[PDB]
Every structure is written in structure tokens, then in C-alpha cells.
Design a protein around this ligand. Structure first.
Ligand code: A1L3N
Ligand code: A1L3N
Ligand code: PLS
Ligand code: PLS
Lengths: 410, 411
């Protein structure tokens, strides 16, 4: 009805609904939120200005909005065991901005994971506030094993004497050893920040070591393996840092929080407290390992580091005569969505790349089991091996159609 | 329903907030009621899409239709305001202002901006905010007697401090802002000009406030105040070199993935603002505000800062009544009238006690209040603040509030 007033906009949204139904979303950072999360974001909480924190707002009328924000704070403390939580960051980027503000001064030396090795842009990129505002020195992975070499990180720390070490990654498929990062931080007098955005759901399910007891500050997004709305979060066990975090978020770098999004965070956090969430997260990892077993035994799809401990994998496609941008293009043509992704010691442009990144949280949410993940990896292999044999790309398109129809959305 | 039974804590709180919005007079000047369509866009499956980059230049695929949506927001914004370029990704007004500064000045540069007590925003140079921490802000205010901007003082300050940038725009300023004078003062000292129209954006879009876009190097705004859209920010410019710096500052500069369900809501609201009926709404906003200022000027104890309004809001110095702004806020909230305490020009109390309250009409106007209803609101406010404890009076106000909200239901 209101769609009559703006048919162009609602038409685009309908096509996007259909695109999400008909494609296999293998983007490691995406998911499908519940009906309840979307209803919270579609609520009248968008109308409320609520600057400040629960019980000490700068506006009238927040007495019931404060319940929502307290639910999100307290469910985060329950899920992750943090003594303090801040649920107002608009995004992972704002969450990391405020975490740095609470820990270091502009120009300070910070050790963070290199982008090609799998770090995030906010872990030290020169085109990002992180690299522009602080002096970042990168660590990476070993060139042969493609996992983090903790003794190399240790050497780097003692050489550079950073005020802060950042751990966490956008494209690292192996377990991060937070105990060792804390060990190294302590040796050089540095604080430790962990960005668990990608693994937060796995951490909540007890399937990846929990960084919260080790890190001075833990940041996260709410929309990856946690399966919540797009937004950020900051955790800490230190009451003094909690006060600095809160001031840094507001009035430091934000104004009004998005209380409708925060309600969706509260919704998603109770979903994650349900025993069914542990089974979901278990299935994410099983599906991912199943998929890595297929790629390991295929010709020309080299799995970075040869294994996965979590939800994602990086695939080196150099053996196939293509770069990551071309691989992403082939797979889109058959309704399989991935992203081109730099690989350790990447030699091509960050917009060409030698690889693609694949993750299983979204298809697992659709209901894929181990057998279905194997099928996806085989269609991916077939499409990249089909050096443009139209007959084969069309078989793959059919295999995708078969899978989406067996696992429709709500 | 089924998910409301899974989580009664959360859904019963939202239900109570729906009732509060129905039953209170929402007089907070920066609030509004978005349409059903805006809420449905924010509640859409667009929340599931990562779309880093810009339309047609994304960092990965899958963005065919997200690109249509965001280009609708960009194009309707350009149409609404007459700008050659728009960025609709900023998560908020604060992020919009962060990126605008990054496109205009370097850390440590001298910036002229409105003082907080005088009506400026925290991002206009407060030392507790990134703006005051990152740049050298020099504040201008209003005149103590007339409580309006003194443009020769701004000129004097600009000539004395040689700012790299002058910022114009306010959060609690009820009078017309002369953007031409600001453009002239900036040119005289060679400064750039940035205008934050967050509060007056809808009025500009309706032609009822002078338009800053032709005078400002960069114009920033929120989408959720008089523009009546979802919570978010936006940046406008006519300069292609600046537009590139703006886009780079927003992403990958200070943000990651945009909120595309919110950006859909921005597209929905921009088309609503392009409709001729938006001009009548915007006119009614100002006529309601002016009708309230008249009531407050007659009452002793509710002193209207500067004695008039040209836009949607007014600031009330309540000290003659023997209370501060915090007590007035709390008195009004206990009779179901929602305002915010607010510093006034030359504030002498703590910024958390304050001498005043701020009142605006966009929300009640959206509910359908006309001038005679705005008059009744102002009378109830006067009565509540003069009542001094008298519960008969306060309950009288409470009945008036329920009369007005029952006359003008939501949806
Ligand atoms: C976004 C993003 N944010 N954080 C990230 C990314 C990734 C990314 C970065 C860039 C870049 C660049 C230079 C700056 C632009 O001027 C290009 C691409 C694809 O073209 C992908 C993907 C999305 C995960 C990535 C990688 N590879 C890593 N590790 O982390
Ligand atoms: C938020 C906000 N952001 N921008 C703003 C505000 C206002 C505001 C600020 C503070 C503060 C502080 C630290 C001050 C340095 O010590 C306290 C209050 C009421 O308690 C209200 C209101 C909401 C409009 C305001 C005022 N008055 C101005 N003009 O603009
Ligand atoms: C570890 C980490 N920390 C922070 C962020 C940023 O979150 P934001 O997009 O909400 O700003 C990301 C985003 N990660 C995106 C790229 O932006 C991805 O596809 O992986 C992240 O991976
Ligand atoms: C002129 C201007 N520019 C920017 C902002 C910040 O927008 P944000 O709250 O979305 O971050 C505001 C917010 N205005 C709020 C105070 O934060 C208010 O109640 O008025 C603003 O008034």
C-alpha cells in the first residue's frame, strides 16, 4: 500500500529478497537474521533520542528504552562473561575507534595483523583511521605454514615496543591463541586488544577460546557468526577502562545510539543464549571443515594453511590461471557469492587478489548439513575448473538451484 | 506472536515504549515520527548485505539491487537539496561531521564553530568530543542581550584567529542563520565554510529556511530530525574534488559496511520530502512553533531565548520560576510531556543542571496538531511549570495531554 507511493524502491527490495533466495551466499561475514531481529529494527524505537547511558540520559522519556539497552548489555555480559559491556557502537569500525581511544594516544605504536595476512582494515591500514592516527606495525603469518608464528610476533614486539597489540582477523581460518598474545603483550609492557568480530558466535558457543579474560578490551560486531543486526560492541573486565570506553563512544565519537538496532542486539543475544545456538555454531564449523576437505582434494583450489578451525577458508586460485577477481566473477555467473580476498604474501593488487574467501555461517543458517556443504564445494570446484565450458557452468547453475530450493528462507 | 513469547522482556518493553509515544506529548526538538514505510525499510532483509564501497564500485559482488537503493537515496538527496554530489552512508550526524572535517582540514587546524551554551552541537568544538580533541576550535556565540548571532563578532574572531574552516549550524538556535554572511566572512579570511543543517534540513528542503548548499564547501545533515527519516547522516557538496575526499573519508576512512536497510529508509524518506505535502507540513511546523512562542512570551517565568523563533524550536530560560532545566524536565515528564533540559546562552549552571529546556514542534506537527493545538500545548507547559507541587494543577495538565493525544492518535 505505502509501496504504491514509492514503487521503484520497493521493487529493488523485492529483487534483493529474490537474490538472497536464489544465490548461495558464501561471504564469510554475512548471515540471515531472524524475523524477530528484523521486527526490532523495524520498530518505533527509531523515533527515540537517547544520548547518554541507561539511567543517565540527556533527554526525557527514556525509561522504557533503558530496559532494551540494559537487556542488550546484560545479555552480552552473560554470553561472553565480561563484567562491562557497551552496546552503542554503530559498527565494528566505531567499536574499534573507541577501543583505541580508550587504550592509546595518537601516534602511539600499535602491533596489528597485516591485511594480506588476514587482518582487518581497521587493524592498521594506511587508508583507514587506524593507520592514519597511530603508528601501526604489522605482523603476518609464516610463508610456508600460513599460520601465525608466535615467536615472530614476540620478536616484533620487543623490537618495536608497542603500546598496544591487536589480535583478531577478517580472513584467518585457524585458532587464535590469545594466551600467547597476552604472554607477548606482558613481556613488552603492552596492552592487548582482541577484535573477535568474525568468531564471536563461535566464542559464545564455547567453540573458540574466549579472548575476554585475556584482553584489556574485546571488540566485536553483532552481525557475523553472532547472527544479529549490523552494529558493534565493546567488552572489558576493567572498570577504569569501562568508563573510558563509555566516554569515548559518547560523547567522544557518536551522538544518539540506534536504539532500534540495539533492540535487535538484545533479541539476537537471547537467541544466542539458547542451547540451539551451540548446535548451530557446531554445524558452522563442521560444514566448513567438510568444505575444506573437498578443496584440499581438488585440483587447483589451494586452501590457505591447509585447514580451518572456524567458519571460513581462503582459496588460492593461482594454479587455475585466474586471479581472485576473475574467480569471484565466474562464481557470481552461476549464483554463488564470494569475495575476492588477498592471501598471505599477496603479490597482486588488493582489488585483483590471488584468492577468494568462503564461509559457512549463512548457508548453515539456511539449514545446510555436512552433505550439503560438500555439494557446494564441488559446484565451486567444477565452476572454476570449467575453463568456460558453457555446458559445465550450466550444470553448476542447476546444482545451485537444486540446493536453494531444498533450503528456502523464511 | 511466537517470538514475542520467546522474549517477553524485550517485546513488553517495546510495547510500553509504543504506548509512551502514543500517550505523551513529544516536544524534543530533534525527534519525529517516521512513516510506516521508513520502518518497513529498516525492518527489511537489506540488513543481511555487506556492501562496502560505493554503487558500481563495491569491493565484492552481490550488490546489484543494493546499488539501485543507494543510488535512489543519492539521487533523491541531490534533487531535494540542489547538490551536485551526495554521500548517504554515514551512520549518523556525528559520523557525517567526522568525515566532513577529514575532507576539509588537518589535525590541529584552527576551526571557528558555535559554542555549546550558545546553541552549537557537541561536534562543533566541544573538548569532550572528537572535534575539540582533534582540532583547535575557537567558539563564537550569540549576543548577551539579543541572544542572536552577532556577525561582526564572527568577522572579528575570524580575522583575529585566521581559521582554516568556519562551521555554521546549531542544535538549540531558534533564529534564521545567514549563510551568506558566513560565506562572506570565510572569503574575507580565506577560510572554508562547512554548514551542519541537521536540525533545519527539512525546512531547507521545503524552502522555509535559506539554503546553505550553494554557500558551503560541504553541507552535512542528519536524516531524522525535521527531514523525518531514519536515524543516519549524510554529506552534500557541489565540488567534485571534495566529493572524492568525502567518499574516501567515509569509507574506508572511518566506516566499514554501510547500513543498507537504513539507506533504504533514507530513500523512502527523501521521496516523502520531495512531495508537495511536505511543504505544508514544514510550514505547519514553523506556524506551530511561533504560536507556542507567543504563549510563552506572555507568561511570566518562561522566558523565550531571543524572544522569537524562525524555525521549529525554542529555548526556555526557566530560572525566574525558581527551578533549573533539570527540575523542569522532570516536572514535565511527570505530566507526560517530554522535553530535554538544555543550556542557554551564557549558561551559569552545570551543563547537567542547565537553566533551560528546549521545545520543538516537528513531532506533534506530524501527529496533526494545528496552531490552536500548539497553543494548548504551550499553555499546559506554562501551567505545569507554574504549578509548584499543586497536584490539582498537574492532574489538570495530565488531562489536557490525554485530550490532545486522543484527538491526534498515531498511525
Ligand atoms: C573491505 C575490507 N575491510 N577489511 C578487510 C577487507 C577485505 C578487502 C580489502 C580490500 C582493500 C583495500 C585497500 C584500501 C582501499 O583503498 C579489498 C578487498 C577486495 O577487493 C577486500 C575483505 C572484504 C575481507 C580484506 C582483504 N583482502 C581484509 N583482509 O580485511
Ligand atoms: C547531547 C548533545 N549533543 N550536542 C548538543 C547536546 C545538548 C546537551 C549537551 C550536554 C553536554 C555535555 C558536555 C559538556 C562539556 O562539559 C548536556 C545536555 C543536557 O544535560 C544537553 C542537547 C541534548 C541539545 C546541548 C545542550 N545544552 C547542545 N547545545 O548540543
Ligand atoms: C574483524 C573485523 N573487525 C571490524 C570489522 C568492521 O565492522 P563494520 O563493517 O560493521 O564497520 C570487520 C568487518 N569485516 C568485513 C570487511 O569490512 C568482512 O567481510 O570481513 C571485521 O572483519
Ligand atoms: C546540528 C547537529 N549535528 C549533528 C548532530 C549529531 O547527530 P547524531 O546524534 O545522529 O550523531 C546533531 C544531534 N542533535 C542532538 C544532540 O546530539 C539533538 O537532540 O539536538 C545535531 O543537532
Amino acid at each position: 500500500d505505502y509501496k504504491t507511493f514509492d514503487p521503484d524502491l520497493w521493487a529493488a527490495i523485492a529483487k534483493e529478497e529474490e537474490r538472497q533466495e536464489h544465490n548461495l551466499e558464501l561471504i564469510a561475514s554475512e548471515n540471515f537474521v531472524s524475523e524477530a531481529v528484523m521486527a526490532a529494527q523495524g520498530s518505533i524505537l527509531t523515533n527515540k533520542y537517547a544520548e547518554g547511558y541507561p539511567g543517565h540520559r540527556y533527554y526525557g522519556g527514556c525509561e522504557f528504552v533503558d530496559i532494551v539497552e540494559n537487556l542488550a548489555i546484560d545479555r552480552a555480559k552473560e554470553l561472553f562473561g565480561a563484567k562491562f559491556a557497551n552496546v552503542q557502537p554503530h559498527s565494528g569500525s566505531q567499536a574499534n575507534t573507541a577501543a583505541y581511544l580508550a587504550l592509546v594516544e595518537p601516534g602511539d605504536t600499535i602491533l596489528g595483523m597485516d591485511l594480506s595476512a588476514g587482518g582487518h582494515l581497521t587493524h592498521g591500514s594506511p587508508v583507514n583511521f587506524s593507520g592514519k592516527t597511530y603508528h601501526f606495525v604489522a605482523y603476518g603469518v609464516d610463508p610456508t605454514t600460513e599460520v601465525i608464528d608466535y615467536n615472530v610476533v614476540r620478536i616484533l614486539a620487543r623490537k618495536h615496543q608497542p603500546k598496544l597489540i591487536v589480535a583478531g582477523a577478517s580472513a584467518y581460518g585457524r585458532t587464535i591463541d590469545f594466551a600467547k598474545f597476552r604472554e607477548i603483550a606482558d613481556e613488552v609492557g603492552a596492552k592487548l586488544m582482541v577484535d573477535m568480530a568474525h568468531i564471536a558466535g563461535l566464542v559464545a558457543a564455547g567453540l573458540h577460546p574466549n579472548p575476554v579474560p585475556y584482553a584489556d578490551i574485546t571488540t566485536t560486531t553483532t552481525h557475523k557468526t553472532l547472527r544479529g543486526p549490523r552494529g558493534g560492541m565493546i567488552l572489558t573486565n576493567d572498570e577504569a577502562l569501562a568508563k573510558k570506553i563509555n566516554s569515548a563512544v559518547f560523547p567522544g565519537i557518536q551522538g544518539g545510539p540506534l536504539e532500534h538496532v540495539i533492540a535487535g542486539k538484545a533479541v539476537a543475544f537471547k537467541e544466542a543464549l539458547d542451547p540451539a545456538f551451540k548446535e548451530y555454531s557446531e554445524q558452522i564449523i563442521a560444514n566448513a571443515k567438510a568444505m575444506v576437505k573437498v578443496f584440499n582434494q581438488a585440483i587447483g583450489t589451494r586452501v590457505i594453511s591447509g585447514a580451518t578451525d572456524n567458519h571460513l577458508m581462503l582459496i588460492d586460485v593461482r594454479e587455475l590461471g585466474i586471479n581472485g577477481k576473475e574467480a569471484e566473477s565466474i562464481l557470481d555467473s552461476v549464483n554463488i557469492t564470494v569475495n575476492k580476498n588477498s592471501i598471505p604474501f599477496e603479490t597482486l593488487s588488493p582489488f585483483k587478489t590471488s584468492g577468494i574467501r568462503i564461509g559457512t555461517p549463512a548457508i548453515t543458517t539456511r539449514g545446510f548439513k555436512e552433505e550439503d556443504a560438500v555439494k557446494v564445494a564441488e559446484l565451486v570446484v567444477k565452476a572454476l575448473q570449467a575453463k568456460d565450458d558453457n555446458a559445465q557452468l550450466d550444470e553448476v547453475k542447476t546444482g545451485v538451484r537444486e540446493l536453494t530450493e531444498k533450503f528456502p528462507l523464511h
